[PDB]
Design a protein around this ligand. Sequence first.
Ligand SMILES: [Mg+2]
Lengths: 1055, 125
Amino acid sequence: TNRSTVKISNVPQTIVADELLRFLELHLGEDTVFALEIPTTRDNWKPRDFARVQFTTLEVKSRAQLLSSQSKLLFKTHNLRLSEAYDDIIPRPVDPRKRLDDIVLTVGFPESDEKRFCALEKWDGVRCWILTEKRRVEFWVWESGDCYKIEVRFEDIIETLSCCVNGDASEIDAFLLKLKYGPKVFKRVTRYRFCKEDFDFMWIRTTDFSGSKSIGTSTCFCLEVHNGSTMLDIFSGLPYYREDTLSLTYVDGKTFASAAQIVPLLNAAILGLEFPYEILFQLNALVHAQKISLFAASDMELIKILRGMSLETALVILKKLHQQSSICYDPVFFVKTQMQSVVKKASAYKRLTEQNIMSCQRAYVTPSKIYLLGPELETANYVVKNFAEHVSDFMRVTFVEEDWSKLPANALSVNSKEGYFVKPSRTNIYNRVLSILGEGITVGPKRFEFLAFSASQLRGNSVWMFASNEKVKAEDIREWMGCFRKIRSISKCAARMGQLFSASRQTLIVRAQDVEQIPDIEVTTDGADYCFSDGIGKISLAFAKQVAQKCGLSHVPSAFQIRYGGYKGVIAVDRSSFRKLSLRDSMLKFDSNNRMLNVTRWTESMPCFLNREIICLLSTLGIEDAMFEAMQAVHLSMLGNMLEDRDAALNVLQKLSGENSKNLLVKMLLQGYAPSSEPYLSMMLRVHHESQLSELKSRCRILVPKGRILIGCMDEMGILEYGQVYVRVTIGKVVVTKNPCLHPGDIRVLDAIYEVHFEEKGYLDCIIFPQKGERPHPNECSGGDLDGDQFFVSWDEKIIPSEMDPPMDYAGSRPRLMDHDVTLEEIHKFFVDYMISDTLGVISTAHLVHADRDPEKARSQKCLELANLHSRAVDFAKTGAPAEMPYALKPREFPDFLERFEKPTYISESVFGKLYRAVKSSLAQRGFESFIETAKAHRDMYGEKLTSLMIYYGAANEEEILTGILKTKEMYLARDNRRYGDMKDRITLSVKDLHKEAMGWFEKSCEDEQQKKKLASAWYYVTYNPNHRDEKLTFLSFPWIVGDVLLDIKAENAQ
Amino acid sequence: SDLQSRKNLTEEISYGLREAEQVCNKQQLMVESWRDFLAVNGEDKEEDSVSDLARFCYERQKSATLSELAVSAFKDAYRDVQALAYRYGDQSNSFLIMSKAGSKGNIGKLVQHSMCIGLQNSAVS
Ligand SMILES: [Mg+2]
């Protein structure tokens, strides 16, 4: 049932395992012990007090526990108290009917016909182990003296059938198991034990071993047990057991056997060279998803009818194949109707250079196969924008688990003792990732090479790739980006090579005759170097007013981050200016040969939020739990009143991000409509009511009205010394902190002053710091530099932390300058070295759960080591030094905030415990006739186009593609919020592009302003009145694409 | 005890006197000529420093400047070997009564009677 491992309480220490088993086989039956293990503190001569033993069945355990409950098991004058301990020293199911010992196993891709599937190779006898407690099914395959393990868990199993091999009436011989992702292939690489089999193995991960990549192309397992008809009751535990009798026909399919390392590729080697790449890319992407089988992908007649028909009419047959949810077994049936229905009913390069909407190719690399997705809308980059012809050559290559998760430190560089000191032993998956980084993915007529990776792509490992064509190559674009031969350290060079890959826009090319040098200002003392001027520039007012009108803002930006070729930093704006580009001394990164004006963030004011480290740090400075519960109560009252009231709905929507004085749902509530009258804004605000509660139950996200998110700045003259900034809100007692705060010393409270001269400078949400005297403010506050970043201020009368502390040394280690130059091989060996020995969220997680469990928060000897290691765990991209997360610091238990079911959840009692228990008791409380034909022709054209965004990503009904938040999450998205934040960006970009296409359709449908006002009445009538409910669904987004002119009907009908 | 408990003690002494040798062999790699071996880098002559067991014993005799850390390492690895006199033997043993009370002798004058004498080093020969 549960387990068979029973931990003995206290066996005597002068006893070997060949003596305790002779006693255990005396009171119980003979040969009833599977294996016994005694832990040793030393290597082989010091046993511990307790020991473990695993019985064969459940009745022996239930008898040995009843014998030990009466204190009748006396061994060497020492009583034994048998207790339960979930260890599972041998992962074997305790059942005589679930332990198969001889079964023929074959692999192969699913069928192109109904019941005729092909097979690549067949193993002559495996050991099938069906576990139930651990949801996995093992396959022990023997080949050439080596032992291999194939683990198939229950999550990838989508269907389970029964097959027939012999051909008799209603006989059970074989079973067909379907898969969609793939298994994990292990490999058995090599006085107190009684394992009576082949054991003492180490199950480390490895690459594919079945010939030449015969596992990743199958995604389907076939099991043929000789008994069959008796074990039909134990196969009901397998998920989605289909009650059907399936036939079988063995077809040889050795044509599709490949020899490369990237599988399954479409083998277009006999089709010739006259094939378009855009068709082969979609035909390769539709194979990895379980839609089209492998024999149908290599059919001659389908390629013949695809090539005898135009390209724009060929892509529409391939993008419509994602509409089918099940596996379409008849491939020509979906094409012969589509080619007859397409005849009744440019922007690829026009969206790159104007509004920066690119169509890039993404790919996931599992340890056994590859997974291509297709084109997706994303913010374009400056590195892509200049090469508008090679947009089909860029490709993102991610390296994930077979279950699409993050690669752990157990698959790469498993630890093994060799001699005196231990050393990490590299596995085959490491040499496979290094080989695919050296050579690349060769799909279609072209290949792919390594290009670069940014500092935000190391976490969530991805690789930008280029095709290296005859015009430009992988080295030509990097030579165009600058020169990276001067930087000898590989860790800084890898970050400098991809610093031009961020999302940015170009405005105006600036030459080199308008460059004026600016000296550096040092405030260093006692041998510790500081820099008040760290990436601070000055710009003329006329070119600032020019770039403000070019970028498209209302007012002039007071400070904005910029990338002038190799430069990086923020620019301040003064009044007496004579030049445009005036950079400081701490701005050079490499040879700035390229001339661009890439900006990434302008000057705008966001409301201040809270972080959980902020609440964890303010609770140990002299502040009790007094105002946090009051702020959470006045937050929860407005969030519970926004679903009923209108002003309460408009108050929180204007304060949260996404409605900065211009939105679709804001102008709808401006007229005075009811939040529950129409069925569109009600379901729009229904998910907005629960979004902030989901951000309150996972994160903190406490709304603070006093403060403004502002960018750092610095004044060139200098009058203030140790003073705050005169802020501008559309005073005193301000608290200045950045985000990566772990030490209790970097808390900083200031006092704002009213200056009669700062009104001429015009500093709008720009904090000014002093530049003389002692150590500066932001360089000692969590190590924040003076570049463009976020800052959190509060001129509130709630917290006011009046307890300062000088922080520790924020200086880093020595940089690892190499002797020779970088020859492109030490970059891959550094990139794969980020998947292992990188504990960034682990240190912050182990520090957040350590302050609530121990008194004197952020001041003990254990809470300081994690805060010291967090300075090195975040600086991996600058200096190549590992985090080296030590032992004896994890508390082996988690509180009730993160809710991980592995560790035991103890009852928390802290500032966050009352912050969680207060919310947790509140979840159970709660042209009227001339536009009919055009609307009837446009409604289906909007609806069937919106289905392509509906069913491609997994939306629920209508709101998961409109609002961007997902209702039902997945396996690879419930824990990786960093990828979810980019997924919700590209959902919003795609629905914004569809709204822009609807606005473009609007311009070709009206010529009069009365017609522009009367089109909205008809477009409201087609989707609001119940007399036009068709067989398909009617989405509540039709009067919101032209919703600006729809409010004038309600403003005209009032008068 | 009567049977097999002396054999377990012998098989544990023979394994605790073979680990205290590998402990002392590790301490002789703290010589400034071995600074290239203790770095984080792959080496080719690393098998010549782990296979030669008679050479590391021969180096402990002559050049008595690393033989002061080969005695103190055995004297620290023998503390886990002298602690075997409490798991073995009853509490009514007449040696453990006079050793725990501090009357005559200690735990060092019992492991030489029962398990093993230990190490032998002189001043100069
Ligand atoms: Mg900064």
